[PDB]
Paper text:
Here, we report the selection of designed ankyrin repeat proteins (DARPins) recognizing mTFP1 (monomeric teal fluorescent protein 1). Here, we report the selection of DARPins recognizing mTFP1, one of the brightest and most photostable FPs in the blue-green spectrum. The two DARPins we report here bind specifically and with high affinity to mTFP1.
The complex with DARPin 1238_G01 did not crystallize, but the structure of both isolated DARPins was determined as well (1238_G01, 1.6 Å resolution, R/Rfree of 16/18) and (1238_E11, 2.1 Å resolution, R/Rfree of 17/21). For DARPins 1238_E11, a high affinity with an equilibrium dissociation constant (KD) value of 3 nM was determined, while the affinity of 1238_G01 was found to be lower with a value of ∼88 nM. Anti-mTFP1 DARPin 1238_E11 and DARPin 1238_G01 differ in 13 out of 21 selected library residues, suggesting alternative binding epitopes, in line with the ELISA experiments. Despite having different binding affinities, both DARPins, 1238_E11 and 1238_G01, bind in a very similar way inside the cell, suggesting that both affinities are sufficiently high.
Residue numbers in the entry: 1 to 162
Amino acid sequence: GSDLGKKLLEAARAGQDDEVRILMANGADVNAEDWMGATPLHLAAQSGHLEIVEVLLKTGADVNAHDAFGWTPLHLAASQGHLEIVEVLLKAGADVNATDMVGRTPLHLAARRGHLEIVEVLLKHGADVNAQDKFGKTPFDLAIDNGNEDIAEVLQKAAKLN
């Protein structure tokens, strides 16, 4: 047939690591893209499938691929709260300050979604506390706007150390 990439995307999304292996062993492209521009690495990162993320990174997946929204796998993991995946992606060379279609970095998304440990990991890897999205908002602003007081404090303190 020829639905290899399509099936690999589905297997990565569903966390079916055995199917991921089978499809890759049969020639499926690890950098296949779905209708939204998401790759297997995007889909595994979104759904929290750590081990599939790790194996894709070992087998040629592009850590900095962006989808139609401008989201990278790191945006997705940071937004969804998958701390270990965030760490693995950063270790593999993910751009900590990549911006999506509205100018938001992974730190914006983690701050908005209230993921404190991810905020701290992103800061450790050089995330930009002063980054403004297309609406002029910093991650601190998005933390305030979403009632994430503890994250806002962490961000306000980090801005003093620049």
